[PDB]
Design a protein around this ligand. Structure first.
Ligand SMILES: Nc1nc2c(ncn2[C@@H]2O[C@H](COP(=O)(O)OP(=O)(O)O)[C@@H](O)[C@H]2O)c(=O)[nH]1
Ligand SMILES: [Mg+2]
Length: 166
């Protein structure tokens, strides 16, 4: 009835900041890596209700270009991350998105994340390109910095609000 558990997965290319977004959200710190068993949790509040976010970092899946069924199983939300300094990470979004289409529950919320927003001297992908990609595919989008915490809390909380309100 009254308390909630939302399973999240974090997906996207190598080095986009999946691990750092996890650690920033759960521990408020920015930095070992146990592939296949790399996770964290944090309690939040939406509409006065207690919601436990159980969050899975899918590092190690990148080489496969696909997410194992056990990550998708019961996943309520997914953060699909690219690295704004590396256009190739932006280019591979459609293949991550198709993997999710084929193998995830259609109700799984997906938020598009352009990470490393602090790195303005190396930006390759404009914020507007992330926005347009998200619109075309019916997703919410935010730029984050796992380094500075910018929009990190907002990304996880807004995903949860979308899951809860759907
Ligand atoms: N400046 C900056 N560096 C970041 C950010 N997120 C991650 N990094 C750096 O990028 C590297 C890769 O991030 P990581 O979380 O390990 O990527 P992953 O393979 O997707 O898990 C890290 O070692 C950090 O040095 C960010 O928001 N800003
Ligand atoms: Mg990782």
């Amino acid at each position: 009835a009254y308390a909630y558990l939302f399973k999240y997965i974090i997906i996207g290319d190598t080095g986009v900041g999946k691990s750092c977004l996890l650690l920033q959200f759960t521990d408020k710190r920015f930095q070992d890596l146990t592939i296949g068993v790399e996770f964290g949790a944090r309690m939040i509040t939406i509409d006065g209700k207690q919601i436990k976010l159980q969050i899975w970092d899918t590092a190690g899946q990148e080489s496969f270009r696909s997410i194992t069924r056990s990550y998708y199983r019961g996943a309520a939300g997914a953060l699909l991350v690219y690295d704004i300094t590396r256009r190739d990470t932006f280019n591979h979004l459609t293949t991550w998105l198709e993997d999710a289409r084929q193998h995830s529950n259609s109700n799984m919320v997906i938020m598009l994340i352009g990470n490393k927003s602090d790195l303005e001297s190396r930006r390759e992908v404009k914020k507007e390109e992330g926005e347009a990609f998200a619109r075309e595919h019916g997703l919410i989008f935010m730029e984050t910095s796992a380094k500075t915490a910018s929009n990190v809390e907002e990304a996880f909380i807004n995903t949860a609000k979308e899951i809860y309100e759907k």
